[PDB]
Symmetry: C2
Subunit: 354 residues, 2 copies
């Protein structure tokens, strides 16, 4: 009783740490993900054309699944990315506390990026709490859309819902650690091994996200492969391998339908980021075996998981990527470099007016 | 200065009239449409498995572009379509005045279809004015989604908007004749050559649709190839060849963005009906020449158009379908039978739980 799924997409992964493109894309395939969008907050950061060119070739050499690379907004590169913009997955704005190179000091710098970045290309924003309203204002002033990363709070999701009710062009994603973990789990985690940005919400925050599922456009892991030597405080959790099992469990419990899952892990990611189809690509999952999330998942070099102990009822059994078996019951069979940059495909270009 | 578009999809076409699958799919390619969904209100109607099997083979022999065929809900076939349901584009309910075979006499028959039709498969409804609210109620009682055909009135679009604000699973399409024509054009058309269902709205209806573009999920021609010997009263207009030129004109005027158009003619149709991608398929359009819609478009056997006289600024220049040039500047180059039933493709199946 296996279910055939399409090639799933994770539009928010941090791959360059111990973790690398090869180790990260392996976790992706083990999670049923055939396409990933890597964030620009690496060392060095992807905030210029030379850095993007290098990262794109390192990924094409190490990635086991297909990918696109985000460009990062900085205090100095507004108006300079116009030539390479189309080659990136989009532009990422880090609006809360972050690294010096990706730190935007004023909302004026936000507006300058919204005005300079090509209007047809995606813009993504890490915006927590009131920052969600502020960035929506900037998007309105510039008359363009914006995608809100990892919505984690009732405050945020209800704000987006009000924006959508008024016809504003806003989309948003939600991560599994904000749908299946809460503050009560900070007692079984602590300040270390628990520090995430946005922080884990209250039970009311988790409940609000589930109640407003219709407002959620995409699911995305926000896979941040930090080791526990680091966490125990860099923010982020690993989640590429736990995402689909957790969500399939929710589908088996009647919390959401299979279509809801597929809309949010396939169709909506494609239409928001204009990511191309993957020919002869599919995932096969088994929903008849219940297991408990171990202390660490097999592939992610993070060597730990915040979902340890949770009972799940779904397993990725097989992943075929562009005609080749890429994953089978605990073994990745495509080598580092099988993955391709989807923005270099002819169908991976974002259509624009002349 | 040509713009490359993806394979566009028209999810609402009546092909079996003079018009046939070969003549209709030719108009589709001339309009930049590479995939169509044919409605079941033919003679005979597609309201049983044998009728569907026949229509599917006639289409596979005459269609020049790819297609899927809707099944039609009747007063007698509820609970009988379960075996062939997955092979259809979806289930079409004709809830207003229609033919005897597709006439549903009571809302109880609606509910029986909503309860029997597979829950994962699309259901589409022709519902005008208050019928839109009634069918949304039935969908809620059965805890499933519904797609509203050709929204034409401020009344309807605002009702759907309220449903969406409350998180109800409803999507809707809008036709070009309800965005670019109004009652004032019934003075240059008359009762004959003007009878359409839903009828042409007032200027306030047209304005309401444009103001609530964010509520519109899909565009669709509702191509009804009736001749003027018939109209001058079968309802419907031809529109496969005028759809894209009219919409591209609106994009050039700043009424909507190219992304808005592509969402509504490509991405959203794919995700609502789970229609598969078309490999090596694209359309090339030129937006630098202004022409006037003639008295009749070249390919549609309808031999007339309600948009006669309107000035447009877009032209389909080239259509490539699965690696072959299917249309070029006034000539269709793929023969009848090149088109395929997308539901028989492995990627064209709607995913479902075991
Ligand atoms: Zn973030
Ligand atoms: Zn992140
Ligand atoms: Zn780290
Ligand atoms: Zn696209
Ligand atoms: Zn099994
Ligand atoms: Zn490669
Ligand atoms: Zn209709
Ligand atoms: Zn119709
Ligand atoms: Zn007719
Ligand atoms: Zn689908
Ligand atoms: Zn030209
Ligand atoms: Zn054929």
């Amino acid at each position: 009783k296996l279910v055939r799924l399409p090639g799933l997409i994770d539009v928010h992964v941090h791959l360059r740490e111990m973790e690398d493109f090869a180790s990260g894309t392996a976790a992706a395939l083990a999670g049923g993900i055939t396409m990933v969008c890597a964030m620009p907050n690496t060392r060095p950061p992807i905030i210029d054309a030379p850095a993007l060119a290098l990262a794109q070739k390192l990924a094409e050499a190490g990635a086991r699944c297909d990918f696109a690379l985000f460009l990062g907004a900085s205090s100095e590169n507004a108006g300079t990315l116009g030539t390479v913009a189309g080659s990136a997955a989009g532009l990422k704005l880090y609006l809360n506390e972050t690294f010096s190179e990706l730190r935007l000091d004023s909302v004026v710098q936000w507006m300058e990026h919204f005005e300079t970045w090509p209007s047809h290309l995606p813009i993504v924003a890490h915006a927590e709490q009131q920052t969600v309203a502020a960035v929506l204002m900037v998007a309105q002033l510039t008359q363009r859309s914006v995608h809100i990363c990892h919505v984690a709070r009732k405050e945020e999701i209800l704000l987006i819902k009000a924006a959508k009710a008024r016809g504003l062009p806003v989309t948003c994603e939600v991560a599994p650690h904000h749908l299946f973990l809460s503050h009560d789990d900070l007692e079984r985690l602590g300040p270390g091994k628990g520090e995430v940005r946005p922080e884990l919400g209250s039970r009311q925050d988790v409940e609000a996200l589930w109640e407003n599922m219709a407002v959620i456009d995409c699911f995305a892991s926000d896979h941040a492969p930090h080791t526990l030597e680091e966490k125990c405080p860099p923010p982020g959790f690993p989640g590429l391998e736990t995402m689909l099992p957790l969500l399939l469990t929710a589908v088996s419990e009647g919390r959401l339908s299979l279509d809801d899952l597929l809309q949010r892990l396939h169709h909506n990611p494609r239409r928001i980021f204009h990511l191309p189809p993957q020919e002869d690509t599919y995932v096969e999952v088994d929903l008849e075996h219940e297991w408990t999330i171990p202390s660490h998942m097999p592939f992610s070099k993070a060597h730990w998981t915040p979902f340890e102990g949770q009972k799940v009822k779904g397993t990725v059994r097989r992943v075929v990527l562009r005609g080749e078996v890429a994953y089978i019951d605990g073994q990745v069979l495509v080598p580092p470099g099988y993955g391709q940059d989807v923005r270099k495909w002819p169908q991976g270009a974002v259509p624009q007016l002349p």
